[PDB]
């Protein structure tokens, strides 16, 4: 387990500046993020081992998202991941 709470709150203050969050609700959000981090990191590990790849690249994270998220949610996550990497390299 890691804490993403202060970063979850940063996202809350972007999308709903005027809405707060209770301690238990933040706990649920943090448990959600941890759970997904593990699933995507573990799947990326699998995928890199399957094809004898030394390196987990943004491509392995993108394939991991498609193996883990439901199709429609995946397509949005892949678009947000790709948007970030395109900005980062710009």
């Amino acid at each position: 387990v890691e804490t993403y709470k202060i970063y979850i709150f940063k996202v809350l203050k972007q999308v709903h500046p005027d809405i707060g969050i209770s301690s238990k609700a933040m706990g649920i959000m943090n448990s959600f993020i941890n759970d997904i981090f593990e699933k995507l990191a573990q799947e990326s590990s699998k995928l890199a081992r399957y094809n004898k790849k030394p390196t987990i690249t943004s491509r392995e994270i993108q394939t991991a998202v498609r193996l883990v998220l439901p199709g429609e949610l995946a397509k949005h996550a892949v678009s947000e991941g790709t948007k970030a990497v395109t900005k980062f390299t710009s």
Binding site: E2, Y4, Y7, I8, K10, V11, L12, Q14, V15, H16, D18, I19, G20, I21, S22, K24, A25, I28, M29, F32, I33, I36, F37, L40, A41, Q42, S44, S45, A48, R49, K53, P54, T55, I56, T57, S58, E60, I61, Q62, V65, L69, P70, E72, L73, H76, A77, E80, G81, T82, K83, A84, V85, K87, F88, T89
Partner: protein, 87 residues
Amino acid sequence: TSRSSKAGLQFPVGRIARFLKAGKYAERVGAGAPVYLAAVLEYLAAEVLELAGNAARDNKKTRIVPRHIQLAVRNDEELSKLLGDVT
């Protein structure tokens, strides 16, 4: 400037890079991998928080509580499929 700032993200690219590089997931983690993963986790937080805030304001509340997250996820096909039930 941070990797997060460069990527246009609130979620912590540096920390997620360290989390991946310590989880012994592969020999190497590329520069892009933690940016992409941080962006995905940020997107999922932002969907859940946007819908749970909407539920709070629809309830005439000023704070997201667990029921609002539960209603947000329940009333979304994809989030229900991903997260299943919220306790």
